[PDB]
Amino acid sequence: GTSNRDWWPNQLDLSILHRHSSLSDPMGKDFNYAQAFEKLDLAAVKRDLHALMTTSQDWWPADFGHYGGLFIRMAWHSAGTYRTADGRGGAGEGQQRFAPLNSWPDNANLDKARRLLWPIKQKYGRAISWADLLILTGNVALESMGFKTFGFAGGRADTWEPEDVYWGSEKIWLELSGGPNSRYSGDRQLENPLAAVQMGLIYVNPEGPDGNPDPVAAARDIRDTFARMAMNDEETVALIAGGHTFGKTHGAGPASNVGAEPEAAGIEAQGLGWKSAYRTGKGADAITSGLEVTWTTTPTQWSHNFFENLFGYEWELTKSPAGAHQWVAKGADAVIPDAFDPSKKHRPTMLTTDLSLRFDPAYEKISRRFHENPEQFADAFARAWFKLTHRDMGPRARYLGPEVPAEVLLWQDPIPAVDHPLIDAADAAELKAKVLASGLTVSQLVSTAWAAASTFRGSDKRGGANGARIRLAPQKDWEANQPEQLAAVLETLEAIRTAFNGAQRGGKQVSLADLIVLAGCAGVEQAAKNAGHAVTVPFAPGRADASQEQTDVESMAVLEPVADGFRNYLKGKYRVPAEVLLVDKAQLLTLSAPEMTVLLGGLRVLGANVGQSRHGVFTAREQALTNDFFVNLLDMGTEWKPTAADADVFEGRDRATGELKWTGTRVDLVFGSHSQLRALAEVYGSADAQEKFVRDFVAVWNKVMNLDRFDLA
Amino acid sequence: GTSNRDWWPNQLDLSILHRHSSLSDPMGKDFNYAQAFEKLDLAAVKRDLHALMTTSQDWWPADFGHYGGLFIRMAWHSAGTYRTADGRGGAGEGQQRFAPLNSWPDNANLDKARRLLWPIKQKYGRAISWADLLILTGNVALESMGFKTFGFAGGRADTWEPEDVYWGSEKIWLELSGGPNSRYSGDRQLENPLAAVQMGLIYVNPEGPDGNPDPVAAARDIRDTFARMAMNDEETVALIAGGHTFGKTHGAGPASNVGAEPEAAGIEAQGLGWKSAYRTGKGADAITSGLEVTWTTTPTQWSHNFFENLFGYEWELTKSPAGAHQWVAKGADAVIPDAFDPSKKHRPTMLTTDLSLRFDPAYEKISRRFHENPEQFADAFARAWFKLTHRDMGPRARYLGPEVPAEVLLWQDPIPAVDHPLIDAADAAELKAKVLASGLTVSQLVSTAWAAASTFRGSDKRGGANGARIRLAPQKDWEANQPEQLAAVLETLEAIRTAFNGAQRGGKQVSLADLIVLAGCAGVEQAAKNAGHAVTVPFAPGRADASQEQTDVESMAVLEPVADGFRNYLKGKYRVPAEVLLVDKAQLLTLSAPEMTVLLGGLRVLGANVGQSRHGVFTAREQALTNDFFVNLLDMGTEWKPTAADADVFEGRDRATGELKWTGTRVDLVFGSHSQLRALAEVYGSADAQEKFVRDFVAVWNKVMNLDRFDLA
Ligand code: HEM
Ligand code: HEM
Ligand SMILES: Nc1ncnc2c1ncn2[C@@H]1O[C@H](COP(=O)(O)OP(=O)(O)O)[C@@H](O)[C@H]1O
Ligand SMILES: [Cl-]
Ligand SMILES: [Cl-]
Ligand code: NA
Ligand code: NA
């Protein structure tokens, strides 16, 4: 059946904004996963998981009699899709169980691992999400094998459909680089926002770059991809060597024996895939990656034998039974156990990417330290494993259960506790009047609060106005935030704050974070009053102010808006059309298409554009909250044409006289072009719509201001 | 950006079930369009539309100074996509303003027509939908040009995103027959459910079949496509000749001058398309279809000139200025006015498909009768226009406003008015006890009610349990309804009915329609009791019983389920996989995926399968309402394989012994295979889910029983 996407493959896709509707969710509209989790007997879940580790099923027999290695790989791949560029991927939504991730070649046979967990999922039901269970299972695996984890938090609610993520443009699984849809350009520069080297891989190719078995070159790809997953050198080495303390790879025969991935398999496979015609198809005969390596002499027990072997042997290039490149220890004795036959032993083996840990010079220093000091290794691995598996969970207020680590980690973007009474409704009214009496304008107040709150992204729940990180490096200097203008606003608000706080009794005070938001609220109320409408914008206090020392400047870089269509802002010229970047930002904000449309049209007329640009400001009463953006955009009396100077800027002229009325960008005019967006614009540009536009604008503004308020959930 | 549909282009698409969420709808969740419409000043709207008729805009100047022909075409196209096979298409959702229909070649320049209406739409806002406005406009165009319409009803709520309709499989607009994705096979047999001859046409090709200008052959295509739009020969001749009493076609120069359709155009085009480089690109120079025909001597006034011209001249084949085949009157004088230049006149001209009305022998007899009795023509056209524009609106209870025709038409599937007291809760309890005491089983009660209610489709709001048409021809004889079993259940219910009704005073009586549904409710209650659960199922009385003479047996044929996954029924072997047909049915029933899931699993254990098939009956307690379907389907202790006899039937055997435990179809097993469906099945097959399953099942059952209850809306 031919679809709209077939006829118009480059038209903008709004379906991404309308995922996760109540229609697709089997749980009631009142279901609260945190409340269910908080009553889970977590210790009981863990006991059942511990038992499972050594209860082999004959349909996928346990290597060494222990499923721990398999489950650790499972949890690492669940988390391993994360990209810092956009926060997408990660373990936080349990997306491994849906397409495409359930059928990526790097996730081969994890379908088996998830199926092993159905009896426990079934027993506990809604009180433990798949998303939490995948991670918990990896932690129990670790514990069962003698490794002390750093802790665990629940709270990852399940999702019910695939997320729309850009994983690359290749049309062939695992395509090598340099194809017509190459994700690499220049000197091996990987395109943002990607964080894997080949389509369908987690991070890197275990044979080496595009299959070339050079550990030094592979190290480059490890370092780049791991950094794009928010891991530094120490963390990277700790993770890889920690993981590869356990279990084995699977490559017992040729890969041509392996059948269709789950999404392609027949209905009778019941959601499993990669059925193998090689011998028994499983166990001793398993084929997963095609490699056949077993790293340590005790694959079912924590040890420091990975680095003992890495450094204690010289390594020879060899081939697995499937033909993949891998390495074997020269001259070694057969000291590695076989997974099924207690009479067989094997020489030590390694992946190309394992040898990167010794042959890259910066890795080698860390790896040596960890070899000489395994307690340092263990602690780094524990810390890195917690980070890996929690990096997309959001603020610590979302962490549930009895095993949450008390230590506050800098990567969590922590917010200090509030230890004083909060402002009440009368205080809020007093502050809004003081802010308006200062002389700050509607535009300055709206723009400041927008800048502070719109850093949120729902992908990894980072950003937002909590913390008042807008006053700190690097936010205070981002171009989109208008550094000089911002500094002036912040100085004014800080003076109002000082004055109010100095007047109080009983310890009541207002944080700068709360006052930035409140001041934006006052701006929107004032703009409504400028239009003739008396409205109260909701405000919820309780944000706190973070310090510079609590703020990782390098980690915060990925949150810089380089494209913010809500402020008509593009930092440079991109391949992707600006309207596509608008919808991407709207999705990060968690906005629907109606929400996106009302918000943008209101921001344009409040003066929120960076640089005071007139593009899209289709009103003669700027700083009044009206629907003028939509009424003027939709006026057929105006004709639009791209400018000669810039194809991305348009002039709107009166059709009869030629008189210049307006200018606009692609982000402004998509609302009058796209057939779905134009239908939304029409509602708000109708003669009956002024009350509705104000009400809906206020509601979406409040939604944005509150995106990171998990303290109120 | 590669998507899941790219990787797995034949996996089932559940997005069709989660359209029309509250996320994409800009109106509040409590918006009620009927209440808005009922307060519209419809008379005011009609005055504005009358004014618009002759208010020419320079960007698309009005032919003859009157937009009435353009608007008639616009409304006839809005309606003209309707297909009786599935009820999809039609005017009722205003879908002409969205992709793909806004850009079909046959809808060229209707973008202009819609844009002329924006000022009126803006003025009246939410109180008139686009969907109602398009039809109202057509009516006013006819009235303006001297034709008295049969009536008009409002109530077509707007929609906010495209419907997922199968329009065909061709990948080329307008492709002629016999290609790789041909919609024709055999003896020019058009594939169900399509009702057009070429991709992007409304019904037929105006040059003739595949472009061949044979009026007799064209008439075969006219007859078939119009029958697939619910129109008979009389209706067809009346509509074509009535439409073509007005206006003209547009083909002033070669089609290669015409640019991108709306969804392909540049952002500056602001939602319009088909910009033409030919001369002024509009008005006298317009190119729409490529034909250049004006049918009557008064194109802006109702006349009897269409049939005068058709019969009064002999016709010669010629070409338009764009090269399209059309006909010109031999020897005629230049009597047809020019649309723009009072000094030019033209000879009478006709399309191939107009000549079909004279050269097909059955049409010729009707055409002659209309030529000799123009009052008959006028009345037939008025009735056909009303049908055309209301065919998809559903029961008359949904018709709004002061111009609704009082006359009840057979095609409306009319339900008699209720003129007696209805049964109350105490009476319902008495009837349910009588039904359970009669010996009817859970299976018989559930299956009967299911058969009665599940004929509803939301596409055209036809079907459902109101009317008790299950007792009439042809529903009573449909294979899926199990005619012999049905007759025995109906005879028992009719005896209960008669006994109850004869005992009442004051006029109270229960309809058979209500009793069917109530007895199904008693079946579900009894099944829940059989499972240990104490459940009351909601019931709303007020259905009435329609007569056989109120039930057009040929129009009812399209409602026959040839595939009904809910009863594991397939009438024959089809090219479309059964699970796609299940999703199709769910969409017609208005079900989400969770609703489809719970419903199907419950129906399987209640004994609703046709023929008492064991396929998917995964329980040892049939006729008890439990979640057994899910718990057993998901048990990894069972392995599934297709049977040797039939690749579409599967056997589930114990993995350890080989012993046969169950059999199932594709519709049963897709719930254990599709990664989204299986995530839903998991919820209902969890240990905590029995009460959730029962409650959800009751809710969805109640939903289905009330789908046609627009008397209660
Ligand atoms: C450069 C990064 C990495 C590469 C290229 C990589 C590669 C692979 C490959 C090819 C396999 C074999 C799959 C199979 O055939 O069964 C595997 C297994 C495994 N990986 Fe990694 N890995 C990486 C990092 C990690 C990390 C960060 C962890 C966890 C902290 C991890 C834990 C494991 C474990 C436990 C197994 C064994 C699975 C079993 O016993 O079934 N790996 N690795
Ligand atoms: C066999 C069925 C039919 C065929 C093949 C057909 C074909 C067409 C074509 C090709 C045009 C010219 C488009 C353009 O170049 O502007 C047209 C115009 C039009 N049709 Fe039809 N038609 C059919 C039935 C109808 C019916 C059922 C109605 C309404 C009751 C209708 C009303 C009109 C009107 C009013 C115009 C004039 C448009 C204008 O003045 O701008 N047609 N038809
Ligand atoms: N309209 C009704 N008439 C009679 N009983 C009802 C009605 N609606 C709900 N109930 C009963 O109340 C129970 C729970 O009510 P509710 O909270 O509305 O959720 P649901 O959408 O599951 O019906 C139902 O399972 C049914 O037995
Ligand atoms: Cl994601
Ligand atoms: Cl439709
Ligand atoms: Na994420
Ligand atoms: Na329809």
Please give the Cα distance from A114 to A137 (Å, whole number): 10
Q: Are strands A563-564 and A569-570 parallel, antiparallel or unpaired?
A: antiparallel
CA B321 to chain centre: 37
A633 lines ligand 1 (CB under 6 A): no
State yes or no: cis peptide before B100, omega within 30 of 0: yes
Q: Which residues lie across from B349 on neighbouring strands?
A: B328
Please give the Cα distance from A188 to A217 (Å, whole number): 11
Please give the Cα distance from B495 to B513 (Å, whole number): 14
Residue of A nearest to B590 (CA): A23
Tell me how far the alpha carbon of residue B583 lies from the centroid of ligand 3, in angstroms: 26
B20 is in an annotated binding site: no
Q: How many other β-carbons are positioned within 10 Å of the β-carbon of residue A533?
A: 18
Closest to A656 measured CA to CA, from A631, A673, A635, A671? A635
| A168 part of contact set with chain B, CB < 8 Å | yes
Please give the Cα distance from B173 to B153 (Å, whole number): 34
Residue A634 and residue B166: Cβ atoms within 8 Å? Answer: no
Close Cβ partners of A657 (under 8 Å, ≥ 6 residues apart):
none
> Considering Cα of A28, then A31, then A37, then A41, what sign does the dihedral take?
negative
Please give the Cα distance from A461 to A710 (Å, whole number): 10
Residue A637 sits at the vertex; the CA angle it makes with A632 and A642, to the nearest 5 degrees, is 80
Phi, psi of A323 (to 5 degrees): 90, 10
State yes or no: cis peptide before B348, omega within 30 of 0: no
Give the position, in ligand 3's atom list, of the atom nearest the Cα of B537.
Answer: 27
The CATH superfamily of B168-372 is: Peroxidase, domain 2 (1.10.420.10)
Nearest residue (CA) to ligand 3, atom 10? B538
Interface test with A, best of B675, B677, B695 (most A CBs within 10 A): B675
Residues B312 and B256 sit within 8 Å (Cβ to Cβ):
no
State yes or no: cis peptide before B193, omega within 30 of 0: yes
Ligand nearest to the CA of B159: 5
Please give the Cα distance from B118 to B136 (Å, whole number): 14
DSSP-derived 3-state class of residue A294: strand
Closest to B281 measured CA to CA, from B108, B36, B537, B130? B108
Residues A665 and A578 sit within 8 Å (Cβ to Cβ):
yes
For residue B293, what are the CA distances in angstroms to B92, B296, B315, B343, B350? 30, 10, 13, 18, 6
**Closest residue to B686, CB basis, from A125, A167, A687:** A125
- Angle at which helices B690-705 and B442-453 cross, to 10°: 50
Torsion, Cα of B373, B377, B379, B384 (10° steps): 160
DSSP-derived 3-state class of residue B552: coil
Q: Which residue has the tokens 């594709």?
A: B666
Please give the Cα distance from A578 to A567 (Å, whole number): 12
Residues of A within 8 A of B582 (CB-CB) are none
Residues of B within 8 A of A44 (CB-CB) are none
Please give the Cα distance from A522 to A499 (Å, whole number): 18
B296 lines ligand 2 (CB under 6 A): no
Active-site positions of B read: 77
Let me know if A77 is a catalytic residue: yes
- CATH of B565-688 given 1.10.420.10, 3.40.50.300, 3.40.50.620, 3.50.50.60: 1.10.420.10
Q: Where are the domains of chain A?
A: 1-167+373-407, 168-372, 408-564+689-713, 565-688
Chain breaks in chain B (C to N over 2.5 A) after: none
Tell me how far the alpha carbon of residue A563 lies from the centroid of ligand 1, in angstroms: 36
Residue of A nearest to B60 (CA): A636
DSSP-derived 3-state class of residue B517: helix
SS3 content of chain B, % helix, strand, coil (to 5): 45, 5, 45
| A169 part of contact set with chain B, CB < 8 Å | yes
State yes or no: cis peptide before B416, omega within 30 of 0: no
Closest to A481 measured CA to CA, from A449, A440, A506, A512? A449
Please give the Cα distance from B540 to A257 (Å, whole number): 59
Close Cβ partners of A172 (under 8 Å, ≥ 6 residues apart):
A179, A199
Residues A274 and A309 sit within 8 Å (Cβ to Cβ):
no
Closest to B167 measured CA to CA, from B233, B235, B103, B111? B103
CATH 1.10.520.10 fits B1-167+373-407, yes or no: yes
Domains B168-372 and B408-564+689-713 share a fold: no
Q: How many other β-carbons are positioned within 10 Å of the β-carbon of residue B447?
A: 26
Residues of B within 8 A of A121 (CB-CB) are 682, 686
CATH 1.10.1200.10 fits A408-564+689-713, yes or no: no
**Burial label, A225 (beta-carbon count in 10 A; 0-12, 13-18, 19+):** buried
Per the structure block, which two tokens stand in for B567?
A: 């009863």
Per the structure block, which two tokens stand in for A417?
A: 């506790």
Ligand nearest to the CA of B296: 2
**Burial label, A499 (beta-carbon count in 10 A; 0-12, 13-18, 19+):** exposed
Q: Which residue has the tokens 């036809």?
A: B462
Please give the Cα distance from A360 to B132 (Å, whole number): 70
- In B270-425, which ranges are E strands? 315-319, 325-329, 336-337, 345-346, 349-350
- Provide the b/e sequence for A318-341 (b: ≥16 CB within 10 Å): eebebebbbbbbeebeeebbbbee
Sheet with B315-319: strands ordered across: B315-319, B325-329, B349-350
Residues B605 and B625 sit within 8 Å (Cβ to Cβ):
yes
Residue of B nearest to A655 (CA): B59
In DSSP notation, B117-179 reads THHHHHHHGGGS-HHHHHHHHHHHHHHHTT---S---B-----SS-------S-SSTTPPTTS
A248 lines ligand 1 (CB under 6 A): yes
B698 lines ligand 3 (CB under 6 A): yes
- Angle at which helices A215-227 and A352-359 cross, to 10°: 90
Please give the Cα distance from B50 to A223 (Å, whole number): 71
**How was this one solved?**
X-ray
Closest to B300 measured CA to CA, from B149, B151, B141? B141
Amino acid at B644: A
Please give the Cα distance from A298 to A303 (Å, whole number): 8
DSSP-derived 3-state class of residue B346: strand
**Burial label, A579 (beta-carbon count in 10 A; 0-12, 13-18, 19+):** buried
Give, as one character, the DSSP assignment of residue B649.
E
Give, as one character, the DSSP assignment of residue A618.
-
Q: Are strands A325-329 and A184-185 parallel, antiparallel or unpaired?
A: unpaired
Close Cβ partners of A517 (under 8 Å, ≥ 6 residues apart):
A449, A452, A453, A465, A539, A543, A705
Q: Which residue has the tokens 């990852």?
A: A156
Residue A673 and residue B124: Cβ atoms within 8 Å? Answer: no
Residues of B within 8 A of A594 (CB-CB) are 23-26
For residue B90, what are the CA distances in angstroms to B114, B195, B198, B202, B387? 16, 12, 17, 11, 11
